[PDB]
Design a protein around this ligand. Structure first.
Ligand SMILES: [Zn+2]
Ligand SMILES: [Zn+2]
Length: 86
């Protein structure tokens, strides 16, 4: 065979990063929730980010709200705890 062509240039570019489908997702600040959303729903009371499902105050158990927990700390003398002689 007999042929020939011209055309070539250098190039130095740092490998491209692993593009991420998502752009920005915020995690819920509720005790018992692992849902996120594109936007960041912040509470004008506790100033925390939550999910649309738990965006409401009481919904996410807003600490600011004037409503304490329906349950108190466990304060009971453990029973059946200790070395039993025989
Ligand atoms: Zn949530
Ligand atoms: Zn709140």
């Amino acid at each position: 065979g007999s042929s020939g062509s011209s055309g070539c240039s250098e190039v130095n570019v740092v490998k491209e990063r692993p593009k991420t489908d998502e752009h920005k997702s915020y995690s819920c600040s509720f005790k018992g929730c692992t849902d996120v959303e594109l936007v960041a729903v912040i509470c004008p009371y506790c100033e925390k980010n939550f999910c649309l499902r738990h965006r409401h105050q009481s919904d996410h158990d807003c600490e600011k709200l004037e409503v304490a927990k329906p349950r108190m700390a466990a304060t009971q003398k453990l029973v059946r705890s200790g070395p039993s002689s025989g």
